Amino acid sequence: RRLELGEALALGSGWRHVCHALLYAPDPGMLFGRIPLRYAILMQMRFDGRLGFPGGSVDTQDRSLEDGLNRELREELGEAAAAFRVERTDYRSSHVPRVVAHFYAKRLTLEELLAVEAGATRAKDHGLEVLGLVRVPLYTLRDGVGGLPTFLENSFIGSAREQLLEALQDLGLL
Amino acid sequence: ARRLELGEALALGSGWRHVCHALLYAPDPGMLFGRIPLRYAILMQMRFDGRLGFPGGSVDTQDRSLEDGLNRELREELGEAAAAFRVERTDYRSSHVGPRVVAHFYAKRLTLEELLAVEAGATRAKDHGLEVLGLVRVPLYTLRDGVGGLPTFLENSFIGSAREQLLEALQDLGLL
Ligand SMILES: [Cl-]
Ligand SMILES: [Cl-]
């Protein structure tokens, strides 16, 4: 299932790689003035009706995983994604058809993150591979179901659900 | 989700909340992977509660009609761009009733250019990042595996009867 980046960097041509990024930004915002949002975190509704992360396939044209991640993101998200670069320091995990899924996480400013939302419609893949961007609600509502717990009952691509949870875990959100 | 006629629903007493939601759609000729027809761009939204639904909201006695209230909530939910059309009584579709809420549904044909400006602008709506977590188009196809596209979309969590309201409008749009 899961493996080391070197372990997977080491692999024959019978494997290709994908790169995906969880973009996040602190948020002092408060739903209804009462419920702290904590962080804005983007996901995308994909062409198959499943929730996933931005990025995509890295191919022989790329000098590295990050060059392919950042290229995929310019195309999926638009020009606001070139305000920053995802680097190896933002890498998190690799997972295994015959595909290795690399996963990254990049802290943005709320301002940067908002610019990415604002420009996402003009992106090439908008209204095609990507049906739109959504933020992950990080709270649980007063009924004990609304919010994250219900968000987590949606359809997710691949291992995106588990990537999400691990990263939230690692943000101190359980 | 027991149904109501619009007149009856309007007759209901001072102890009911009324909500109004709108399915905004334009025809779209494009093809996914240049081979799979989109047919229409139809807007839905990810709500604060992690459920998919339609733009709209509460309507109160301070609204001179359900329509005025819907256009007001549409402006809150999606921004300036939505002011460029009014959703009127002719676009009305159905009303449903738990806790003395009545929920009214509209469907409104926009021009593809109008629908885009709505998405382009939604990041500036008051509710964006609050009640509205972002917009999404409904995928109307089913993909070669017979599960991706629409039928997987339908397995996501929906608020109220948005699934039913959606499915209803797709049927009335003539989609099998
Ligand atoms: Cl490589
Ligand atoms: Cl009228």
Residue numbers in the entry:
A (entry chain B): 5 to 100, 104 to 181
B (entry chain A): 4 to 100, 103 to 181
Task: Quote the authors verbatim.
F36A and F61S mutants were designed to enlarge the mouth of the enzyme with the aim of easing the recognition and processing of the ADPr conjugated to proteins. H24W and F61S mutants behave as dimers in solution as shown by the size-exclusion chromatography profile similar to HsNudT16. The crystal structures of mutants F36A and F61S show that the replacement of the phenyl side chain of these residues with a methyl or a hydroxymethyl group, respectively, opens up the mouth of the enzyme. The structural overlap of the HsNudT16-ADPr complex structure with the HsNudT16 F61S structure shows that the serine side chain opens the mouth only by about 1 Å. On the other hand, though the F61S mutant does not change significantly the width of the protein mouth, the activity towards free ADPr is decreased, suggesting that Van der Waals interactions between the phenylalanine side chain and the ribose reduce the possible conformational changes of the bound ligand and thus facilitate ADPr binding. Crystallization was successful for the H24W, F36A, and F61S mutants and the structures helped rationalized the effects of our single-point mutations. Despite co-crystallization efforts with ADPr, electron density for the substrate could not be seen in the binding site of these mutants. Compared with the wild-type, HsNudT16 mutants Δ17, F36A, and F61S have reduced hydrolysis activity towards free ADPr, comparable processing ability for MARylated proteins, and improved catalytic efficiency for PARylated proteins.
In addition, although NudT16 was initially characterized as a nucleolar U8 snoRNA decapping enzyme, it is involved in mRNA decapping and expresses across mouse tissues. Given the versatility in the recognition of substrates with diphosphate bonds, we and others have used some of these Nudix enzymes in vitro for processing ADP-ribosylation to a unique mass tag for site identification by tandem mass spectrometry (MS/MS). In this study, we sought to understand how HsNudT16 binds and hydrolyzes different forms of ADPr using X-ray crystallography.
